[PDB]
Amino acid sequence: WNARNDHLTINQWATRIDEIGEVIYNVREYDAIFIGGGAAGRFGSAYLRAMGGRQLIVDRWPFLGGSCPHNACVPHHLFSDCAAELMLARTFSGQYWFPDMVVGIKEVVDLFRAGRNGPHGIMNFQSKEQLNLEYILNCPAIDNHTVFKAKNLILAVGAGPGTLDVPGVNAKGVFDHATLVEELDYEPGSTVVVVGGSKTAVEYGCFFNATGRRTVMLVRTEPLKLIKDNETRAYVLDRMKEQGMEIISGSNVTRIEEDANGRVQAVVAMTPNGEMRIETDFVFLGLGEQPRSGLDLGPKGEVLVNEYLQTSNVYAVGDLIGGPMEMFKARKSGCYAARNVMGEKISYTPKNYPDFLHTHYEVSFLGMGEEEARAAGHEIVTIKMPPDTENGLNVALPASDRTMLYAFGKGTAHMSGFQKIVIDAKTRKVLGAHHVGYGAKDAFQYLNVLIKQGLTVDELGDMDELHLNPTHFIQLSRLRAGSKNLVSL
Amino acid sequence: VWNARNDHLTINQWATRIDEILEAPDGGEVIYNVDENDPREYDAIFIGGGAAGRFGSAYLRAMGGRQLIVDRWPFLGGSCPHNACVPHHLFSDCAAELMLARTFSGQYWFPDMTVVGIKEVVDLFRAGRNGPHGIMNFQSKEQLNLEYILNCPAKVIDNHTVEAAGKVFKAKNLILAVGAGPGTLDVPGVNAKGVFDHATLVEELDYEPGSTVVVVGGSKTAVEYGCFFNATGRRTVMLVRTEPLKLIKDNETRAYVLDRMKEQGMEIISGSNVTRIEEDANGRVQAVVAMTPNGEMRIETDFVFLGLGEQPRSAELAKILGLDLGPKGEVLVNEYLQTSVPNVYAVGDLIGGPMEMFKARKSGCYAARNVMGEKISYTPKNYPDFLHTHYEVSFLGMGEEEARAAGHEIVTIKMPPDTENGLNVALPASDRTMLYAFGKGTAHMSGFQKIVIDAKTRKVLGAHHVGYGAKDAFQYLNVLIKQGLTVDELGDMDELHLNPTHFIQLSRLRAGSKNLVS
Numbered sequence A: 001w002n003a004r005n006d007h008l009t010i011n012q013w014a015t016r017i018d019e020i021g022e023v024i025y026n027v028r029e030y031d032a033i034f035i036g037g038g039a040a041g042r043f044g045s046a047y048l049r050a051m052g053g054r055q056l057i058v059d060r061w062p063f064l065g066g067s068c069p070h071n072a073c074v075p076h077h078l079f080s081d082c083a084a085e086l087m088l089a090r091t092f093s094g095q096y097w098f099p100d101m102v103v104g105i106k107e108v109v110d111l112f113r114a115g116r117n118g119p120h121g122i123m124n125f126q127s128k129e130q131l132n133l134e135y136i137l138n139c140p141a142i143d144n145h146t147v148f149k150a151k152n153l154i155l156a157v158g159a160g161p162g163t164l165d166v167p168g169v170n171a172k173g174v175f176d177h178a179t180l181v182e183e184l185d186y187e188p189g190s191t192v193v194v195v196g197g198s199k200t201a202v203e204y205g206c207f208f209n210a211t212g213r214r215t216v217m218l219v220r221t222e223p224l225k226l227i228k229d230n231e232t233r234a235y236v237l238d239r240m241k242e243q244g245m246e247i248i249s250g251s252n253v254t255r256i257e258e259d260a261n262g263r264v265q266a267v268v269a270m271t272p273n274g275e276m277r278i279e280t281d282f283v284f285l286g287l288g289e290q291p292r293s294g295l296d297l298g299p300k301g302e303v304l305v306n307e308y309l310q311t312s313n314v315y316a317v318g319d320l321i322g323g324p325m326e327m328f329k330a331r332k333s334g335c336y337a338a339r340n341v342m343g344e345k346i347s348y349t350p351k352n353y354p355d356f357l358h359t360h361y362e363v364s365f366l367g368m369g370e371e372e373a374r375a376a377g378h379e380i381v382t383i384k385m386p387p388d389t390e391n392g393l394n395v396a397l398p399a400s401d402r403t404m405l406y407a408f409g410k411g412t413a414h415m416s417g418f419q420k421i422v423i424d425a426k427t428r429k430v431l432g433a434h435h436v437g438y439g440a441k442d443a444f445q446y447l448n449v450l451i452k453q454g455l456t457v458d459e460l461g462d463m464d465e466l467h468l469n470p471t472h473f474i475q476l477s478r479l480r481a482g483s484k485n486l487v488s489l
Numbered sequence B: 001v002w003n004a005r006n007d008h009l010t011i012n013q014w015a016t017r018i019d020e021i022l023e024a025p026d027g028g029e030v031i032y033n034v035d036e037n038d039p040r041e042y043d044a045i046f047i048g049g050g051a052a053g054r055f056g057s058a059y060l061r062a063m064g065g066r067q068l069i070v071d072r073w074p075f076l077g078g079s080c081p082h083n084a085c086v087p088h089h090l091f092s093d094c095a096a097e098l099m100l101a102r103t104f105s106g107q108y109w110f111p112d113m114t115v116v117g118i119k120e121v122v123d124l125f126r127a128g129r130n131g132p133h134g135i136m137n138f139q140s141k142e143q144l145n146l147e148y149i150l151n152c153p154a155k156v157i158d159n160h161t162v163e164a165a166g167k168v169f170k171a172k173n174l175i176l177a178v179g180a181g182p183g184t185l186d187v188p189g190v191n192a193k194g195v196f197d198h199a200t201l202v203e204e205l206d207y208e209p210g211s212t213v214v215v216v217g218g219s220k221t222a223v224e225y226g227c228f229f230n231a232t233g234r235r236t237v238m239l240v241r242t243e244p245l246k247l248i249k250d251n252e253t254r255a256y257v258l259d260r261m262k263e264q265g266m267e268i269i270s271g272s273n274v275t276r277i278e279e280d281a282n283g284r285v286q287a288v289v290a291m292t293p294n295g296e297m298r299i300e301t302d303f304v305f306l307g308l309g310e311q312p313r314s315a316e317l318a319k320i321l322g323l324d325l326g327p328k329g330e331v332l333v334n335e336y337l338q339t340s341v342p343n344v345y346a347v348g349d350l351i352g353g354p355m356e357m358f359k360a361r362k363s364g365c366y367a368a369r370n371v372m373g374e375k376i377s378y379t380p381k382n383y384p385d386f387l388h389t390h391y392e393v394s395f396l397g398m399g400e401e402e403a404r405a406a407g408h409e410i411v412t413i414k415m416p417p418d419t420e421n422g423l424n425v426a427l428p429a430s431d432r433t434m435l436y437a438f439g440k441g442t443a444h445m446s447g448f449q450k451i452v453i454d455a456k457t458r459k460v461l462g463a464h465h466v467g468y469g470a471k472d473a474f475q476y477l478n479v480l481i482k483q484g485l486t487v488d489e490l491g492d493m494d495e496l497h498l499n500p501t502h503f504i505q506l507s508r509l510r511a512g513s514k515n516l517v518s
């Protein structure tokens, strides 16, 4: 279908994408052909075009934007929203406007499926009409100059879900993030088994638990290693366990038992305390994504690239080059490859970036944890909420938007959140920041920039805080910055 | 007088004790926390231990000076925990959650919403407000090493002399931090039962309001409380004296906010002045009569909320000290927070607008630094700002029309885009707007945001956001913008997708061009 001279609206695009199928054909020599039009390929194309170069995107999906809108970040955020709202409803069940509190997993997945063509339509419309891009969609993509001829290739095919080499892994009722939003044709029973212990497993597991299902996470090593501050990690894990989640470390699935109809009936796992069998008809695999890869490859199948994103005229970007598999990495690697193709030699080594994951809370972190900073030899002070006292977490701070009910409810104050900054006592520089609650994720983007510039506790204290703020760092810093001899709070 | 100096109560013990003192029929004991073994003179006595006095004391003590806080409240922190910022946020949380529940009424886990008790939420606040009070007393004494006398009005004798708890204290300076009182209306029936302000709402609500609420004013307070009252299921009429939400300078952002308020059922009346509050034979409000641009209006109601500007508490102190006052009763100060009276500073809401926590705390600290010999000026402006409706509304810098009127060639980067589909598209979207983004016919509710950029310098001139989870970000973003942030530098940050503000990645989408395009 030649839609080059066809100007459809966002919602007309959404409809056409749902309908599709025919190849969507929207077409100087090409400076680069992008193999894949996800975050890396789409942003790389946008930047290359904006620089005045010629680009072509070829993707097997009939929409641009890749996994993010179809089965990754967007559905994850919808599920995390549900997890947080459901924790609130269950905590205040039968109080105020809250009714007596099992949420239908399939209805939420079906809501996502019914609405995901909105973002698809925005992607196709914005890419064609506003970003001036050429693309061929709903078509899978010869040599380092041939696909169409181009001066360079930029490989941006992403990564695929990790698999498990155990009997029963293909049983009906085993899902990953990709298949959950394509093949869920029943409502899961009362138990969920989640395999894995990092972001995807924890985010989806907290959603399943929030729907009212007994949720058992089988973690190969130790959960949430990305949270380096020990107290922050312990708060996050403690709140997950209080919600009823069961986290079993050092455990490996031995087999997924199939019933006579081919459906999951149980998971058998080895743990440090021996073998256990969990009855379930629903298993979610939250394992690491695997790059879709004469290129030199790394140990995990990632395509090897130098600091200019060049492989062994062929660049590679995004999840295809391995961790960190985040949207900032995919989009920046795509743009930087495009700039190098267009003659602007610029290196990219992702380092000292902010990070985040969802449980029933938003969990934001950057820089050093407290113990990590001390083990590196720093005199450190910490400024945190709640304070270290005999009352512990059972006090009405920290408190901000979407945490006030916890702060004021009977016996719920410990759920109002946790946060901390780690400060070098000699330089007065902020070395790390950590937050559990809501509404700080966005701030950590900009805070990390200030910290990379050399932010001190005095400079933090001298800012204008928008009370009551998700992060209390500004004013709590101001309470201590008047002393040349810094003291923790 | 309770000599508390050598008692070391926990946070929760403080919460209980403050509750007891606040409920004592005889007013309760004076809380006396003075280091009677320290021979040093007081560098400053703070009249008031709210945000300004408490932070000023903390900073002065941290610098090595001696301070003495004297407040009439049995707790530190002032209006913020007791009847201002804290209860406000509690109510705004409720307003946002209730808009969500009403939008998805009878779907997923949500109950059928086709009237929430205002009194039970206020009672919840009253039952839990001692927690913050306890932390304030505990942090101030055990962590910040502050001296204070609470549950005792201060009696200023002169510019170096103050009486408290039957004793006279001398100080090198006074720092006045008594704040402001609720604004009132000079109309017949204003003292009727059923007429409340932010202070009286959390102390005197002994009944559950009826189906209609009349809010007087267009302040942040008026809009914040109004949205909460509307969200409980009540017809809510706002009587704005001038034009609503003038603080939102960007016309597009303001229009989005107002449109969403009206979609929730709020009636916003501009150019309006209450002429009388009608009382029934029981002494309770039965109606509000107001002059509007469309003539006289009479609204039947048994519940009126006044959200007028706060009035600096300057009268007594100006008589005793001879302080120069401004037209609204604010205490006049130079840029070092010095009043007209030697060795007397004034801070916080007492010095007038802007009446914000950052202003109160920073003015307290800068006064303290000047007292301690560090000449430092404080003139607040180019600060970020926010308010609640059923959404969080965040803004800094220039609106689009304001930037053009100031002579800038500008481009804008916004979500949703200007297309035939308008707001009815699934962006912007992030935490706490995903249901709106995906729901049947609710996409327009997923928010609105815009940055304003100078087309020549590429500098970001202003930022505006309606949604959730960007308020905290605007604190740090404003600093970066005051440093001279360009669209290129913004594009080069690390975003945390899906982000409340999409500014980073959308900037990156346009930053590749020499000639910027919206």
Ligand SMILES: Cc1cc2c(cc1C)N(C[C@H](O)[C@H](O)[C@H](O)COP(=O)(O)OP(=O)(O)OC[C@H]1O[C@@H](n3cnc4c(N)ncnc43)[C@H](O)[C@@H]1O)c1[nH]c(=O)[nH]c(=O)c1N2
Binding pocket: A035, A036, A037, A038, A039, A040, A041, A058, A059, A060, A061, A065, A066, A067, A068, A071, A072, A073, A076, A139, A140, A141, A156, A157, A158, A159, A177, A200, A289, A292, A317, A318, A319, A320, A324, A325, A326, A327, A328, A330, B496, B497, B498
């Ligand atoms: C469940 C879950 C949740 C999240 C995340 C991942 C997952 C699995 N991520 C990570 C994020 O999704 C990831 O980093 C980016 O989507 C990677 O973008 P790429 O463009 O590299 O791959 P991506 O997979 O997006 O794009 C690859 C594209 O190439 C196409 N393709 C593949 N093979 C092809 C062929 N042979 N021919 C043509 N086309 C082909 C595919 O169709 C696809 O469109 C994330 N990150 C984040 O920052 N925040 C978050 O909240 C989350 N959340």
Ligand SMILES: Cc1cc2c(cc1C)N(C[C@H](O)[C@H](O)[C@H](O)COP(=O)(O)OP(=O)(O)OC[C@H]1O[C@@H](n3cnc4c(N)ncnc43)[C@H](O)[C@@H]1O)c1[nH]c(=O)[nH]c(=O)c1N2
Binding pocket: A466, A467, A468, B047, B048, B049, B050, B051, B052, B053, B070, B071, B072, B073, B077, B078, B079, B080, B083, B084, B085, B088, B152, B153, B154, B177, B178, B179, B180, B198, B221, B310, B313, B347, B348, B349, B350, B355, B356, B357, B358, B360
């Ligand atoms: C309803 C509402 C909602 C909000 C806000 C205000 C209001 C009214 N504010 C503004 C904020 O509350 C205000 O700017 C600060 O609390 C001002 O702090 P001060 O210390 O100046 O006065 P504050 O009023 O807090 O303190 C004055 C203290 O002096 C004491 N005092 C008075 N007379 C005395 C006497 N004779 N002797 C001894 N002590 C005496 C009082 O007891 C009181 O403790 C706000 N700001 C913001 O930044 N974000 C927000 O969300 C909100 N929300």
Ligand SMILES: O=S(=O)(O)CCS
Binding pocket: A038, A039, A040, A042, A043, A064, A065, A066, A068, A069, A073, A074, A119, A327, A331
């Ligand atoms: O990064 S992309 O804009 O392509 C997809 C966002 S869901």
Ligand SMILES: O=S(=O)(O)CCS
Binding pocket: B050, B051, B052, B054, B055, B076, B077, B078, B080, B081, B085, B086, B132, B357, B361
């Ligand atoms: O600013 S204070 O910490 O004094 C009160 C906050 S509610």
Ligand SMILES: [Mg+2]
Binding pocket: A386, A393, A394, A395, A396, A397, A398, A413, A414, A415, A416, A417
């Ligand atoms: Mg707490």
Ligand SMILES: [Mg+2]
Binding pocket: B416, B423, B424, B425, B426, B427, B428, B443, B444, B445, B446, B447
């Ligand atoms: Mg929208």
